[PDB]
Amino acid sequence: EAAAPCHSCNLLDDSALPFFILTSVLGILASSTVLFMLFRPLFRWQLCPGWPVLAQLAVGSALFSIVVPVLAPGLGSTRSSALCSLGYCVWYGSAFAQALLLGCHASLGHRLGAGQVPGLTLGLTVGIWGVAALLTLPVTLASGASGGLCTLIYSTELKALQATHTVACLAIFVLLPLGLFGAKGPWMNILWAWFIFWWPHGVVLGLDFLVRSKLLLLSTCLAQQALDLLLNLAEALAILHCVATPLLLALFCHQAT
Amino acid sequence: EAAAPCHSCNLLDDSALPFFILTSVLGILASSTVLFMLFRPLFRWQLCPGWPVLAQLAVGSALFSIVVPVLAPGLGSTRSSALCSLGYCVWYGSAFAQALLLGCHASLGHRLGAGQVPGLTLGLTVGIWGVAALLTLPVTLASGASGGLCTLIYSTELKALQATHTVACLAIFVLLPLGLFGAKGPWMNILWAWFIFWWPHGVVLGLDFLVRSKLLLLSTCLAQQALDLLLNLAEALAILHCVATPLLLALFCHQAT
Amino acid sequence: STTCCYRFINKKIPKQRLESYRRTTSSHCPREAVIFKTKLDKEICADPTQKWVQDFMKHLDKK
Amino acid sequence: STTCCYRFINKKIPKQRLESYRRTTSSHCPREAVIFKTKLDKEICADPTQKWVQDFMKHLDKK
């Protein structure tokens, strides 16, 4: 009769500090590089179709790369709830903004084919960034620091907020790409790697919502171990996004030329 | 039979370049001063009640001061509809953002009474700026240049977008302040001088909407001349906002201490 | 610039006294009008629905 | 971290064999249990619903 309590694998915690700090530094470096290789038009980057959307995707990646380490574990205490809320807010806002830029481009390439329409492009970018900053309200409201470390908040007085946040994440991350891929080899543009990177973080969040809200129930310790292993793997696959996105952007730019 | 055709008074035109360029320079100087006397804590600005809201209002006044000259007349050609759209977009975005921040500080003062709540303050500011960037979509879509000057567009189909824009402007600029005061003096602290600089820009915008839509009619020449004069006077009372607002903030902060 | 007139008249005009032709911008204006400029430094607006203005528009050199 | 007990048991336990006591964190955990540390340094989780475990908690010094 063992009846021993179950224990989690717990990969991402402190012992994995390099995967946060070095990843953030490489991300900011690469994003700034691909940003001022566009801000300096001496490298013949002005002939690209719809370059401002490309640059906005790059600057979103830069913001996400900058923000990575503030919510990263490994660092000690004294991290106030303000900084953690800032981190979640801007991180998820950057994710939403990039996903919205991709959804806009994949659907209005026809409109972009008319050149750089001033009013249309400006209205699109301002509205997309506004709605991205609006969609991060539930996560930034349902954020906190449990002992000084960034965790999401699942409490009775935050149930509605976290449900709205998780349904928005589900939509933007797995329903938006597959929705664009509906109409029941691949034909659409190669930049689906963004949604391939955010797909695990879309699928796992619904399961986390179901489990954390007591709707479902787990079977054995193996199920719990698989659950948090999948959660950590999805977090890693969403955090390598910093280095993922700009390189894909550069390949797209230098392949369609 | 004189029957002289009515010529527009056209006050603000090129000969009034000072009221644009000098006002923009003074506004950016004052806004940067009041912002960097806040960002340097050695001047005892730390213990102010809800100082981040004041900082957001100041940075809005700043951005407004920067945008002032781009759409101002007097400068010649080579300006495109892109620059005019940018000017109106960030102009009205700053106006909406400041008005919404004042609305928040007026209605949610009790919430700010609990000190600097991190999550609440961050959510409020991010949502306010997102919705401000959202509300400026109609004006930035209905903007253009006719030879270089930046004017709003009243076409046969843009009447819907411009109607949405003008009802939003009416709400934000005159229904919101009076609505806060609609409890039918003691209340309405000194900072309600902000909406005195846009109440004309709401009423005249509504009248201009009605006139352009051709549903109303101009009975006399004096009526048209007075309408033009009122439009230009409201534009001037809106441009002086850039220099007015930070001084009001400074008076409030050094009088409530 | 930005010229309108609320009370355009459709009376006759001197054929030889006119100098040039113009049109109005109805932006704020009531009923659409047309601007006639004369050689004696007089600029007038007239009702475009009359037959006399129809004759004048075609009789104008406009070339 | 993320300690949980999915198979809590309500069977009786010896009183002297324990060394310390602990509470649970039901964040991801299914139906709740309790944590007790034996004198043999072996952890254990058990069903807190039973009467025997309730008497065990009552007998615990917990101070």
XYZ file of C-alpha atoms in Angstrom:
640
model
C 0.000 0.000 0.000
C 1.939 3.038 -1.121
C -0.858 5.647 -1.475
C 1.852 8.273 -1.917
C 0.768 11.792 -2.943
C 1.307 12.708 -6.583
C 3.998 15.227 -7.529
C 4.428 17.308 -10.675
C 7.391 17.239 -13.047
C 7.791 21.046 -12.841
C 10.249 21.703 -15.665
C 10.183 25.450 -16.340
C 10.932 26.613 -12.774
C 14.116 28.340 -11.635
C 16.625 25.785 -12.974
C 15.596 26.857 -16.517
C 16.579 30.554 -16.223
C 18.685 30.513 -19.442
C 15.610 29.575 -21.502
C 14.098 32.889 -20.355
C 17.003 35.343 -20.164
C 19.041 34.248 -23.183
C 15.872 33.803 -25.235
C 14.717 37.332 -24.379
C 18.124 38.822 -25.206
C 18.376 37.005 -28.541
C 14.794 38.001 -29.321
C 15.329 41.701 -28.667
C 18.587 41.616 -30.643
C 17.050 39.908 -33.684
C 13.853 41.971 -33.590
C 15.738 45.264 -33.355
C 18.021 44.124 -36.182
C 15.132 43.294 -38.516
C 13.446 46.527 -37.412
C 16.273 48.914 -38.284
C 16.995 46.956 -41.450
C 13.582 48.341 -42.474
C 13.960 51.757 -40.820
C 17.124 52.144 -42.949
C 15.911 51.790 -46.562
C 19.468 51.619 -47.918
C 19.227 47.798 -48.133
C 16.490 47.744 -50.831
C 13.713 46.766 -48.415
C 11.322 49.429 -49.761
C 10.164 47.395 -52.788
C 8.223 44.885 -50.670
C 4.406 44.632 -50.896
C 2.700 45.829 -47.727
C 5.882 46.451 -45.759
C 4.290 48.442 -42.859
C 2.311 45.373 -41.775
C 5.567 43.405 -41.857
C 7.257 46.070 -39.727
C 4.348 46.064 -37.272
C 4.654 42.292 -36.913
C 8.370 42.824 -36.265
C 7.784 45.528 -33.646
C 5.232 43.305 -31.922
C 7.881 40.594 -31.778
C 10.302 43.172 -30.362
C 7.865 44.152 -27.609
C 7.244 40.496 -26.733
C 10.993 39.816 -26.645
C 11.531 42.819 -24.360
C 8.726 41.729 -22.045
C 9.675 38.024 -21.697
C 12.032 38.272 -18.669
C 9.794 40.351 -16.372
C 7.364 37.454 -15.812
C 10.060 34.787 -16.064
C 10.846 32.672 -12.980
C 14.382 32.206 -11.654
C 14.525 35.731 -10.285
C 13.871 36.096 -6.575
C 11.198 38.032 -4.697
C 10.351 41.789 -4.722
C 8.453 41.415 -8.022
C 5.322 43.430 -7.295
C 1.928 42.550 -8.734
C 2.189 45.733 -10.818
C 5.148 44.474 -12.857
C 3.581 41.023 -13.257
C 0.315 42.561 -14.452
C 2.283 44.737 -16.875
C 4.084 41.660 -18.183
C 0.953 39.610 -18.788
C -0.900 42.590 -20.269
C 1.707 43.566 -22.848
C 2.723 39.951 -23.584
C -0.804 38.845 -24.427
C -1.484 42.149 -26.179
C 1.513 41.552 -28.433
C 0.328 38.011 -29.157
C -3.187 39.242 -29.982
C -1.854 42.110 -32.101
C 0.380 39.878 -34.207
C -2.402 37.333 -34.687
C -4.736 40.133 -35.766
C -2.181 41.502 -38.241
C -1.833 38.022 -39.735
C -5.600 37.599 -39.960
C -5.916 41.027 -41.562
C -3.209 40.350 -44.150
C -4.355 36.849 -45.115
C -7.875 38.173 -45.760
C -7.180 41.641 -47.226
C -4.225 40.903 -49.470
C -6.666 41.900 -52.211
C -7.054 45.349 -50.640
C -3.289 45.584 -50.086
C -2.751 44.805 -53.780
C -3.906 48.352 -54.576
C -0.628 49.593 -53.087
C -0.092 51.447 -49.824
C -3.547 52.952 -49.359
C -3.004 55.616 -46.662
C -6.404 55.805 -45.008
C -7.099 52.075 -45.158
C -3.699 51.055 -43.786
C -3.745 53.658 -41.012
C -7.283 52.826 -39.917
C -6.540 49.104 -40.000
C -3.382 49.370 -37.900
C -4.858 51.771 -35.339
C -8.037 49.726 -34.926
C -6.137 46.443 -34.729
C -3.786 47.727 -32.042
C -6.702 49.275 -30.149
C -8.708 46.056 -30.160
C -5.574 44.085 -29.226
C -5.036 46.370 -26.232
C -8.727 45.909 -25.433
C -8.634 42.095 -25.592
C -5.850 41.906 -22.982
C -8.140 43.426 -20.334
C -9.308 40.090 -18.810
C -5.783 38.682 -18.451
C -4.405 41.910 -16.986
C -7.318 42.041 -14.533
C -6.854 38.362 -13.628
C -3.134 38.562 -12.891
C -1.084 38.422 -9.724
C 2.149 37.385 -8.051
C 1.847 34.344 -5.771
C 4.831 34.873 -3.496
C 6.478 37.096 -6.113
C 6.109 34.872 -9.201
C 3.777 35.365 -12.158
C 0.722 33.101 -12.200
C -2.749 33.565 -13.611
C -5.588 34.029 -11.122
C -8.466 31.532 -11.010
C -10.817 32.601 -8.214
C -14.557 32.939 -7.692
C -14.483 36.721 -8.126
C -12.464 36.272 -11.358
C -14.340 33.350 -12.960
C -16.080 35.468 -15.596
C -12.905 37.391 -16.424
C -10.810 34.253 -16.872
C -13.570 32.575 -18.906
C -13.702 35.566 -21.251
C -9.912 35.548 -21.469
C -9.734 31.839 -22.263
C -12.483 31.981 -24.894
C -10.731 34.956 -26.507
C -7.447 33.030 -26.474
C -9.162 29.971 -27.958
C -10.626 32.094 -30.749
C -7.548 34.153 -31.594
C -5.113 31.238 -31.377
C -6.847 28.122 -32.749
C -10.210 29.200 -34.152
C -8.807 32.130 -36.136
C -6.145 30.074 -38.003
C -8.323 27.016 -38.617
C -11.163 29.400 -39.431
C -8.973 30.927 -42.121
C -8.203 27.309 -43.092
C -11.842 26.241 -43.349
C -13.835 25.796 -46.570
C -14.481 22.100 -45.956
C -0.443 20.321 -50.097
C -1.134 23.602 -48.308
C -1.811 26.660 -50.464
C -1.895 29.657 -48.114
C 1.185 31.724 -47.332
C 4.096 30.176 -45.454
C 3.726 32.380 -42.373
C 1.413 29.902 -40.584
C 4.372 29.223 -38.294
C 3.035 31.960 -36.007
C -0.175 30.041 -35.377
C 1.720 26.744 -35.289
C 3.733 28.233 -32.426
C 0.658 29.546 -30.605
C -1.552 26.500 -31.278
C -0.448 24.515 -28.175
C -1.008 27.609 -26.034
C -4.485 27.811 -27.539
C -5.513 24.197 -27.057
C -4.052 23.764 -23.565
C -5.703 26.897 -22.169
C -9.185 25.446 -22.633
C -8.229 22.286 -20.755
C -6.672 24.421 -18.016
C -9.911 26.413 -17.782
C -12.010 23.246 -17.559
C -9.811 21.640 -14.894
C -9.235 24.784 -12.818
C -12.967 25.608 -12.767
C -13.877 22.170 -11.298
C -16.019 21.322 -14.341
C -13.921 18.275 -15.233
C -11.959 15.866 -13.040
C -8.683 14.014 -13.526
C -8.181 10.250 -13.380
C -4.691 9.440 -12.065
C -1.328 11.017 -11.288
C -0.247 10.186 -14.843
C -3.007 12.447 -16.170
C -1.841 15.326 -13.961
C 1.786 14.796 -14.980
C 0.831 14.810 -18.657
C -1.282 17.926 -18.081
C 1.436 20.074 -16.556
C 4.024 18.659 -18.970
C 1.814 19.804 -21.854
C 1.292 23.171 -20.152
C 5.044 23.729 -19.804
C 5.726 22.530 -23.356
C 3.116 24.961 -24.693
C 4.643 27.769 -22.623
C 8.075 26.993 -24.081
C 6.683 26.806 -27.626
C 5.036 30.193 -27.072
C 8.152 31.743 -25.518
C 10.473 30.701 -28.361
C 8.120 32.844 -30.462
C 10.537 35.755 -29.911
C 13.229 34.122 -32.028
C 10.694 32.370 -34.267
C 8.740 35.255 -35.776
C 11.391 37.708 -37.127
C 13.334 34.963 -38.915
C 10.152 33.783 -40.642
C 9.444 37.420 -41.540
C 12.886 37.790 -43.119
C 12.550 34.523 -45.046
C 9.148 35.619 -46.367
C 10.557 39.005 -47.380
C 13.620 37.583 -49.154
C 11.701 34.743 -50.840
C 8.906 36.781 -52.461
C 11.371 39.341 -53.878
C -28.870 95.010 -58.030
C -25.896 94.188 -55.834
C -26.792 90.551 -55.061
C -23.179 90.074 -54.021
C -22.147 86.422 -53.558
C -21.021 85.602 -50.033
C -17.284 85.087 -49.585
C -15.987 83.087 -46.635
C -14.306 84.976 -43.804
C -11.677 82.177 -43.643
C -9.874 83.471 -40.562
C -7.471 80.632 -39.709
C -5.952 80.397 -43.212
C -2.248 80.741 -44.062
C -1.801 84.276 -42.680
C -2.333 82.718 -39.224
C 0.749 80.439 -39.300
C 1.949 81.671 -35.859
C -1.169 80.326 -34.103
C -0.124 76.895 -35.428
C 3.679 76.711 -35.342
C 4.375 78.793 -32.238
C 1.477 77.143 -30.417
C 2.807 73.682 -31.297
C 6.318 74.555 -30.115
C 5.102 76.100 -26.854
C 2.783 73.146 -26.275
C 5.459 70.507 -26.806
C 7.849 72.471 -24.582
C 5.305 72.806 -21.763
C 4.154 69.188 -22.048
C 7.702 67.822 -21.993
C 8.452 70.066 -19.011
C 5.446 68.909 -16.986
C 6.169 65.291 -17.952
C 9.881 65.296 -17.076
C 9.257 67.150 -13.826
C 7.077 64.108 -13.044
C 9.514 61.456 -14.308
C 12.224 62.907 -12.035
C 11.045 62.189 -8.458
C 13.384 64.745 -6.837
C 10.713 67.479 -7.086
C 8.269 65.865 -4.601
C 5.662 64.768 -7.155
C 5.541 61.190 -5.854
C 2.777 61.463 -3.230
C 0.173 62.968 -5.569
C -3.206 61.172 -5.617
C -3.453 59.059 -8.760
C -0.424 60.574 -10.464
C -0.317 58.056 -13.388
C -3.648 59.434 -14.635
C -2.126 62.923 -14.563
C 0.901 61.587 -16.448
C -1.344 60.019 -19.094
C -3.244 63.289 -19.512
C 0.070 65.142 -19.841
C 1.440 62.724 -22.444
C -1.814 63.056 -24.372
C -1.376 66.828 -24.370
C 2.196 66.199 -25.530
C 1.207 64.015 -28.490
C -1.423 66.617 -29.389
C 1.252 69.330 -29.345
C 3.471 67.247 -31.640
C 0.640 66.606 -34.090
C -0.498 70.274 -34.203
C 1.655 71.515 -37.136
C 1.351 68.579 -39.555
C -2.253 69.346 -40.566
C -2.067 73.107 -40.046
C -2.513 75.322 -43.128
C 0.055 77.870 -44.306
C 2.520 75.223 -45.420
C 2.462 74.622 -49.162
C 2.041 71.455 -51.198
C 3.826 68.045 -51.015
C 1.533 66.982 -48.156
C -0.406 63.808 -48.934
C -3.614 62.328 -47.574
C -1.422 59.991 -45.508
C -0.045 62.847 -43.406
C -3.487 64.435 -43.017
C -4.965 61.092 -41.956
C -2.170 60.591 -39.419
C -2.709 64.101 -38.097
C -6.456 63.774 -37.612
C -6.108 60.230 -36.265
C -3.680 61.045 -33.469
C -5.307 64.469 -32.911
C -8.720 63.010 -32.161
C -7.203 59.982 -30.442
C -5.447 62.259 -27.964
C -8.644 64.269 -27.490
C -10.731 61.137 -26.850
C -8.080 59.614 -24.582
C -7.874 62.724 -22.410
C -11.657 63.039 -22.203
C -12.018 59.381 -21.220
C -9.254 59.683 -18.617
C -11.044 62.673 -17.079
C -14.269 60.666 -17.117
C -12.519 57.817 -15.306
C -10.941 60.135 -12.725
C -14.342 61.772 -12.160
C -16.492 58.638 -11.858
C -13.905 56.211 -10.427
C -12.348 58.502 -7.822
C -13.533 56.152 -5.081
C -11.647 53.306 -6.772
C -8.511 55.471 -6.806
C -9.161 56.217 -3.124
C -7.706 52.795 -2.260
C -4.289 53.990 -3.447
C -2.518 52.865 -6.624
C -4.228 49.548 -7.323
C -1.922 47.900 -9.899
C -4.315 45.693 -11.834
C -7.187 48.177 -11.829
C -5.042 51.131 -12.913
C -3.285 49.152 -15.647
C -6.541 47.758 -17.008
C -8.147 51.198 -16.954
C -5.316 52.907 -18.828
C -4.866 50.141 -21.414
C -8.598 49.882 -22.108
C -8.997 53.658 -22.252
C -6.199 54.034 -24.788
C -7.471 51.063 -26.799
C -11.001 52.437 -26.995
C -9.608 55.897 -27.815
C -7.639 54.395 -30.705
C -10.830 52.594 -31.735
C -13.033 55.709 -31.683
C -10.700 57.580 -34.064
C -11.369 55.095 -36.882
C -14.157 57.104 -38.615
C -12.198 60.375 -38.628
C -9.046 58.660 -39.894
C -11.058 56.911 -42.616
C -12.920 60.098 -43.626
C -9.804 62.286 -43.879
C -7.893 63.529 -46.885
C -6.065 66.404 -48.530
C -7.363 68.823 -51.178
C -4.203 70.359 -52.610
C -2.357 69.978 -49.304
C -4.790 71.242 -46.684
C -6.292 68.623 -44.366
C -10.098 68.584 -44.261
C -12.749 66.069 -43.301
C -14.560 64.268 -46.119
C -18.324 64.591 -46.665
C -19.082 62.364 -49.652
C -22.314 60.742 -50.828
C -21.403 57.509 -49.003
C -19.024 58.656 -46.236
C -22.056 60.203 -44.531
C -22.396 57.050 -42.415
C -18.790 57.036 -41.195
C -18.852 60.791 -40.622
C -22.188 60.484 -38.804
C -20.660 57.893 -36.482
C -17.643 60.143 -35.987
C -19.736 63.214 -35.193
C -22.079 61.398 -32.811
C -19.013 60.028 -31.007
C -17.525 63.532 -30.890
C -20.798 65.003 -29.622
C -21.037 62.349 -26.909
C -17.424 62.518 -25.744
C -17.117 66.310 -25.861
C -20.490 67.677 -24.675
C -22.746 64.808 -23.535
C -20.074 63.314 -21.270
C -19.273 66.506 -19.264
C -22.874 67.660 -18.931
C -23.909 64.062 -18.290
C -21.495 63.948 -15.366
C -23.092 67.227 -14.235
C -26.606 66.058 -15.157
C -27.504 65.252 -11.535
C -30.735 67.239 -11.437
C -20.530 74.758 -7.864
C -19.423 72.313 -5.159
C -18.582 69.439 -7.478
C -16.868 69.654 -10.850
C -13.305 70.304 -9.625
C -11.185 72.889 -11.466
C -10.070 70.415 -14.125
C -13.461 70.505 -15.892
C -11.856 73.380 -17.782
C -10.690 70.650 -20.171
C -14.157 70.252 -21.690
C -14.595 74.014 -22.094
C -11.992 73.647 -24.855
C -14.078 71.040 -26.716
C -17.739 71.916 -25.931
C -17.559 74.368 -28.863
C -15.880 71.661 -30.938
C -18.840 69.406 -30.193
C -21.677 71.842 -30.806
C -20.163 73.267 -33.994
C -19.313 69.777 -35.240
C -22.950 68.782 -34.819
C -24.154 71.905 -36.613
C -21.647 71.302 -39.421
C -22.924 67.733 -39.750
C -26.497 68.982 -40.072
C -25.517 71.653 -42.607
C -23.383 69.390 -44.814
C -26.045 66.659 -44.895
C -28.247 69.207 -46.754
C -31.141 68.403 -44.408
C -30.901 71.906 -42.956
C -30.542 75.078 -45.017
C -28.824 78.448 -44.661
C -31.472 81.169 -44.665
C -29.250 84.253 -44.920
C -25.726 85.287 -45.843
C -25.082 86.413 -42.266
C -25.982 82.896 -41.122
C -23.311 81.342 -43.347
C -20.705 83.913 -42.312
C -21.501 83.326 -38.634
C -21.264 79.562 -39.146
C -17.815 79.950 -40.699
C -16.715 82.264 -37.884
C -17.998 79.845 -35.234
C -16.231 76.907 -36.893
C -12.921 78.782 -36.960
C -13.340 80.052 -33.387
C -14.016 76.510 -32.170
C -10.949 75.263 -34.049
C -8.857 77.923 -32.294
C -10.382 77.089 -28.902
C -9.444 73.463 -29.589
C -5.880 74.229 -30.710
C -5.203 76.262 -27.557
C -6.019 73.107 -25.554
C -2.437 71.909 -26.112
C -1.070 74.744 -23.983
C -4.107 74.971 -21.686
C -4.256 71.444 -20.269
C -0.774 70.953 -18.688
C -1.027 74.321 -16.941
C -4.370 73.241 -15.478
C -2.746 70.015 -14.273
C 0.072 71.978 -12.627
C -2.366 74.354 -10.926
C -4.388 71.400 -9.627
C -1.334 69.548 -8.315
C 0.155 72.590 -6.569
C -3.212 73.729 -5.178
C -4.465 70.387 -3.827
C -1.163 69.774 -2.002
C -12.571 80.808 -52.249
C -15.393 79.009 -50.396
C -18.090 81.171 -51.956
C -21.858 80.679 -51.779
C -25.002 82.747 -52.312
C -28.493 82.084 -50.965
C -30.535 84.272 -53.325
C -29.366 83.659 -56.902
C -31.461 85.524 -59.486
C -32.337 84.371 -63.013
C -32.627 87.751 -64.759
C -30.939 88.764 -68.009
C -27.251 89.604 -68.421
C -25.289 91.859 -70.803
C -23.786 89.668 -73.515
C -20.707 91.768 -74.297
C -19.912 92.811 -70.707
C -18.984 89.352 -69.397
C -15.330 88.397 -68.951
C -14.973 84.835 -67.622
C -16.798 81.842 -66.152
C -16.777 80.036 -62.814
C -18.604 77.481 -60.676
C -19.360 77.184 -56.967
C -18.477 74.695 -54.222
C -21.761 73.677 -52.586
C -19.999 72.400 -49.433
C -21.977 74.533 -46.968
C -24.127 76.142 -49.623
C -27.881 75.976 -50.244
C -29.224 75.527 -53.803
C -26.414 74.986 -56.305
C -25.328 78.127 -58.136
C -22.929 79.306 -60.830
C -20.459 82.203 -60.714
C -20.248 84.669 -63.609
C -17.402 87.198 -63.717
C -17.839 90.373 -65.762
C -15.395 92.761 -67.413
C -16.406 95.681 -65.151
C -15.011 93.945 -62.022
C -18.401 92.525 -60.995
C -18.868 88.879 -60.009
C -22.433 87.586 -59.771
C -24.231 84.292 -59.175
C -27.356 83.286 -61.075
C -30.017 80.593 -60.976
C -28.829 77.722 -63.223
C -32.380 76.487 -63.912
C -33.269 79.337 -66.287
C -33.084 79.220 -70.075
C -30.930 82.364 -70.223
C -28.109 80.700 -68.285
C -28.448 77.665 -70.565
C -27.952 79.974 -73.550
C -25.012 81.701 -71.846
C -23.230 78.439 -70.996
C -23.155 77.349 -74.648
C -22.539 80.875 -75.972
C -19.476 81.117 -73.722
C -16.302 80.584 -75.737
C -15.029 78.020 -73.197
C -12.019 77.284 -75.407
C 5.391 21.537 -6.648
C 1.728 21.241 -7.687
C 1.238 18.508 -5.098
C -2.002 16.548 -5.406
C -3.640 13.278 -4.336
C -6.132 11.644 -6.704
C -6.578 8.393 -4.731
C -7.125 9.502 -1.137
C -7.724 6.575 1.228
C -9.751 6.665 4.450
C -8.143 3.614 6.069
C -6.908 3.873 9.681
C -3.260 4.712 10.349
C -0.946 4.329 13.349
C -0.667 7.400 15.547
C 3.013 7.258 16.546
C 4.357 6.656 13.019
C 3.801 10.274 11.925
C 6.193 13.214 12.235
C 4.416 16.263 10.781
C 1.235 17.386 9.044
C 0.417 19.515 6.012
C -2.445 20.930 3.954
C -3.173 20.580 0.243
C -3.328 22.879 -2.783
C -6.337 22.011 -4.934
C -5.206 24.192 -7.875
C -5.216 21.345 -10.406
C -6.051 18.600 -7.933
C -9.245 16.530 -8.125
C -11.262 15.720 -4.980
C -9.413 17.116 -1.978
C -7.132 15.206 0.382
C -4.601 15.913 3.131
C -0.841 15.460 3.531
C 0.870 13.868 6.531
C 4.577 13.143 6.998
C 5.548 9.913 8.736
C 8.428 9.468 11.161
C 9.945 7.195 8.486
C 10.290 10.308 6.267
C 7.683 8.819 3.917
C 4.909 11.171 2.831
C 1.288 10.038 2.595
C -2.073 11.352 1.410
C -5.406 10.220 2.810
C -9.125 10.952 2.714
C -10.025 13.654 5.286
C -13.731 12.733 5.228
C -13.464 9.760 7.606
C -14.003 9.954 11.357
C -10.676 8.266 12.143
C -8.721 10.923 10.243
C -10.778 13.609 11.997
C -9.764 12.145 15.358
C -6.180 12.030 14.069
C -6.296 15.755 13.284
C -7.831 16.406 16.706
C -5.045 14.444 18.424
C -2.373 16.296 16.427
C -0.500 18.802 18.580
C -0.312 21.320 15.703
C 1.639 23.806 17.844
